[PDB]
Design an enzyme around this catalytic site. Structure first.
Site, short mmCIF file in Angstrom:
data_model
loop_
_atom_site.label_atom_id
_atom_site.label_comp_id
_atom_site.label_asym_id
_atom_site.label_seq_id
_atom_site.Cartn_x
_atom_site.Cartn_y
_atom_site.Cartn_z
N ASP A 108 -3.83 1.23 -1.74
CA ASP A 108 -4.13 1.69 -0.22
C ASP A 108 -4.99 0.56 0.33
O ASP A 108 -5.93 0.14 -0.40
CB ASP A 108 -4.11 2.62 0.24
N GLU A 125 -7.17 -4.28 3.86
CA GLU A 125 -7.34 -5.11 5.16
C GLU A 125 -8.70 -5.34 6.05
O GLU A 125 -8.84 -5.63 7.03
CB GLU A 125 -6.19 -4.62 6.52
N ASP A 131 1.63 3.45 8.22
CA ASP A 131 1.27 4.98 8.98
C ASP A 131 2.09 4.94 10.14
O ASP A 131 2.08 4.01 11.05
CB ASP A 131 -0.24 4.94 9.29
N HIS A 144 -6.78 20.72 6.43
CA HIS A 144 -6.14 21.97 6.10
C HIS A 144 -6.29 23.17 7.19
O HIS A 144 -6.10 24.21 6.78
CB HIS A 144 -7.07 22.41 4.87
O1 LIG Z 1 -8.45 11.89 -0.12
C1 LIG Z 1 -8.12 10.31 -0.12
C2 LIG Z 1 -8.17 9.76 1.34
O2 LIG Z 1 -7.23 10.63 2.23
C3 LIG Z 1 -7.05 10.08 3.48
O3 LIG Z 1 -6.68 8.82 3.26
C4 LIG Z 1 -5.39 8.58 2.87
C5 LIG Z 1 -4.52 7.78 3.92
O4 LIG Z 1 -5.15 6.38 4.03
C6 LIG Z 1 -4.01 5.62 4.60
O5 LIG Z 1 -4.12 5.65 6.13
C7 LIG Z 1 -2.77 5.40 4.05
O6 LIG Z 1 -1.85 4.62 4.87
C8 LIG Z 1 -2.12 7.09 4.40
O7 LIG Z 1 -0.88 6.92 3.70
C9 LIG Z 1 -3.20 7.87 3.34
O8 LIG Z 1 -2.66 9.15 3.35
C10 LIG Z 1 -8.40 10.30 4.15
O9 LIG Z 1 -8.31 9.84 5.48
C11 LIG Z 1 -9.45 9.64 3.34
O10 LIG Z 1 -10.61 9.82 4.10
C12 LIG Z 1 -9.55 10.02 2.03
O11 LIG Z 1 -10.69 9.42 1.16
#
Ligand SMILES: OC[C@H]1O[C@H](OC[C@H]2O[C@H](O)[C@H](O)[C@@H](O)[C@@H]2O)[C@H](O)[C@@H](O)[C@@H]1O
Ligand SMILES: [Ca+2]
Ligand SMILES: [Ca+2]
Ligand SMILES: [Ca+2]
Length: 703
Positions: free
Chosen positions: A438, A441, A503, A568
């Site tokens: 992920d 950018e 997203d 949660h």
């Molecule tokens: O626990 C890992 C991580 O989870 C979230 O981020 C995941 C999120 O990141 C991007 O927006 C992707 O595009 C999404 O598909 C993912 O679900 C928390 O925001 C982050 O703080 C945490 O470290």
């Protein structure tokens, strides 16, 4: 003190309060000059030193201050700022150079380009005494031509009539409305209504802008950043002509071609950010089994200690000085979040389910961090393998997500290996199958330094390509397929793993926008594409949306559901068939998920075989109509119909309340996927659409 940075923070679509706007100042036009103070001030002025004339501007406050010069003189000058603090100090800034630019039609550079669509004397060069900053040139387009490409786009298939650009950016939701993308490319196809096509690729990793016959109805205006160093300017533009497929193949010979992939990527992918313990993950996989909704891949995002993204949460270990761990280094408490991660992974494998772990190309530097993550951070800086500011110190992430985090330098083999060696034990000892790579950018700044010798003007857009490459190479070296799952990319991304559309909210417009994203992405050689079906953010999708989206998603290259982090809190926001069923009071969604997952499994040999063909032919899997039917003008009125491989024509239902849906069938004989009812092509056909149906038509072969 006074802070002034000519280019500012270099957010691609925005400007800070301490810069010149425009960043490359232009003789004739207006110039806006901003600066900030670290303490409060009553007054600030800007002094501008031209040869014979001195000017002093009383700046106005927005601790930001601003003034503007309405018609900028064409002479080199210098400027500095004088501020009066509330306590009565006079502060004074560094000296700054002002070298105003103009557009000139003189042969300052050469545009190396073939084919008859280049306008011979369209080149304009933006020049100053510092050198040549940008070029602006033109290509002609004919009245029956349509323009598809520029990477993954979310607004519309046909880019004609639009102004856009190609810069890697994170647009958190509504990517269609804002006209931005995670995965642009400086490439496009131009396809006419007699079946023939041509294409172009500006061979650069710098920013590019396109006016695709918006201002001048028969001209595509291309503008190319020539960059920070500003050296005799030569811009190479690759071109091809022939069938639409010949043109895409042209680009892939340059950019890179999709990889072979194992067949398990074509099952249903389960994901949810709030599955953050071993027991939460297993609870969901046991539910999949007991409901008869088979899953082939589970993605775990919240797996780690949330500090270094290298170690499972609550794992115990002897502290390292930032060198890589092995699997036998860890003891896992019985009452921790992950009591036996190796056991989870083994059991899931024994069930036919592969495991993927989320990753981010950032090293946190919060002052909350424990000793292991700090040591990991100091060792990254100590390695040299960190993206740097012009002064040589490490680049600190300019975003508000992961503020001031370090960015590993993945521009060289040694730096990619350094970063991924920290993760090797996950693959080699715990046996994970891939990574959700992920982000990527985060690098903003023309003047950043990479170890390959590029500055940020070329390296920043290239970052996510190097990033996906890094983890792919890790996986290959460990005896596994390079299954990376990424959202950002550029020219080159075609060769490195899988992609998802990023997203979005759970809306009908985002569903439509996601279809458009898959088709446009396919049209630039992003073959293994998916999306978060029915949206990942906000309340659970309404039942009708989930039904229509799950159906559509069954006929796309990668099928998965995912949910955003929600602290949660209640209610539960999983996009599981059962959670969406409970929250919507529509128990029928579980049956429907059973139904379409049965369709998905029956579709797997077709997906495997058509993927193999796609690798040889160069054609997309999620395939726009023009690849096989560009001689039929009527395809352009139906831009959210698409072919899945050679044989199936898919038309998702993208409106609430729909009981019938209309599809345009191109020339040939076609067969309703569900009933076997034969229709003749060259016509519109109408279908009843109960939630157990998505319109799909199969070519009728010979007997
Ligand atoms: O626990 C890992 C991580 O989870 C979230 O981020 C995941 C999120 O990141 C991007 O927006 C992707 O595009 C999404 O598909 C993912 O679900 C928390 O925001 C982050 O703080 C945490 O470290
Ligand atoms: Ca050790
Ligand atoms: Ca076995
Ligand atoms: Ca703090």
């Amino acid at each position: 003190m006074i802070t002034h940075r000519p280019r500012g923070i270099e957010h691609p679509y925005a400007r800070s309060l301490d810069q010149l706007y425009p960043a490359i100042p232009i003789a004739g036009q207006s110039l806006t000059i901003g600066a900030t103070t670290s303490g409060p001030c009553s007054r600030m002025r800007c002094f501008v030193l031209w040869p014979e004339h001195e000017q002093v501007f009383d700046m106005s406050p927005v601790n930001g201050w601003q003034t503007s010069i309405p018609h900028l003189p064409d002479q080199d000058a210098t400027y500095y700022f004088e501020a009066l603090t509330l306590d009565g100090r006079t502060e004074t800034s560094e000296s700054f150079p002002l070298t105003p630019s103009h557009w000139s039609a003189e042969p300052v550079g050469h545009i190396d380009i073939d084919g008859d669509r280049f306008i011979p004397d369209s080149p304009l060069w933006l020049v100053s005494s510092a050198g040549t900053h940008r070029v602006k040139f033109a290509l002609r387009i004919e009245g029956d031509e349509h323009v598809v490409g520029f990477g993954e786009r979310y607004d519309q298939l046909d880019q004609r009539g639009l102004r856009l650009d190609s810069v890697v950016f994170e647009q958190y939701k509504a990517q269609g409305k804002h006209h931005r993308t995670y995965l642009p490319m400086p490439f496009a196809q131009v396809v006419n209504e007699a079946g023939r096509a041509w294409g172009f690729h500006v061979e650069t990793t710098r920013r590019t802008w396109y006016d695709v016959a918006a201002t001048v109805s028969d001209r595509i205006l291309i503008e190319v950043d020539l960059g920070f160093e500003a050296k005799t300017p030569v811009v190479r533009v690759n071109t091809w002509s022939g069938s639409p497929t010949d043109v895409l193949n042209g680009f892939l010979d340059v950019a890179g071609r999709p990889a072979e992939m194992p067949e398990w990527i074509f099952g249903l992918w389960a994901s949810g950010n709030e599955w953050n313990t071993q027991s939460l993950v297993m609870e969901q996989m046991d539910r999949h089994r007991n409901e008869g909704i088979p899953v082939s891949v589970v993605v775990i995002e919240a797996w780690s200690d949330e500090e270094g993204f290298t170690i499972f949460r609550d794992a115990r270990y002897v502290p390292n000085q930032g060198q890589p761990h092995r699997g036998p280094d860890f003891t896992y408490p019985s009452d921790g979040a992950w009591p036996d991660p190796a056991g989870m992974i083994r059991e899931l494998h024994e069930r036919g389910i592969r495991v993927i772990l989320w990753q981010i190309p950032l090293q946190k530097t919060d002052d909350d961090l424990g000793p292991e993550a700090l040591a990991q951070g100091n060792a990254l800086i100590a390695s040299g393998h960190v993206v740097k500011e012009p002064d040589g110190t490490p680049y600190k992430n300019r975003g508000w997500w992961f503020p001031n985090a370090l960015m590993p330098d993945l521009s060289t083999e040694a730096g990619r290996q350094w970063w991924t060696e920290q993760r090797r034990y996950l693959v080699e000892d715990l046996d994970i199958d891939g990574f959700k790579t992920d982000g990527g950018e985060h690098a903003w700044g023309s003047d950043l330094r990479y170890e390959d010798g590029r500055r940020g003007d070329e390296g920043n857009n290239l970052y996510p390509v190097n990033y996906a490459r890094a983890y792919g190479d890790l996986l290959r070296s460990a005896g596994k397929y390079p299954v990376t799952f990424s959202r950002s990319g550029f020219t080159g991304s075609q060769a490195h793993g899988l992609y998802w559309a990023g997203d979005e909210d759970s809306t009908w417009e985002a569903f439509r926008s996601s279809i458009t994203a898959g088709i446009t992405a396919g049209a630039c050689g992003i073959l293994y594409w998916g999306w978060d079906l029915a949206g990942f953010s906000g309340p659970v999708p309404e039942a009708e949306l989930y039904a229509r989206a799950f159906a559509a998603a069954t006929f796309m290259p990668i099928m998965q559901y995912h949910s955003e982090f929600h602290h949660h809190e209640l209610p539960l926001r999983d996009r599981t068939p059962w959670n969406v069923a409970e929250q919507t009071g529509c128990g029928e969604l579980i049956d429907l998920a059973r139904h379409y997952t049965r369709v998905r499994e029956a579709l797997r040999p077709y997906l495997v075989a058509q993927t193999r063909q796609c690798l040889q032919t160069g054609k997309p899997l999620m395939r726009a109509m023009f690849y096989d039917h560009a001689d039929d003008p009527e395809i352009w009125a139906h831009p959210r119909q698409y072919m899945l491989g050679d044989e199936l024509l898919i038309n998702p239902v993208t409106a609430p309340g729909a009981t019938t849906w209309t599809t345009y069938l191109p020339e040939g004989q076609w067969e309703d996927y569900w009933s076997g009812e034969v229709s003749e092509g060259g016509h519109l056909v109408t279908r009843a659409v109960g939630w157990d149906i998505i319109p799909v038509y199969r070519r009728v072969g010979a007997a």
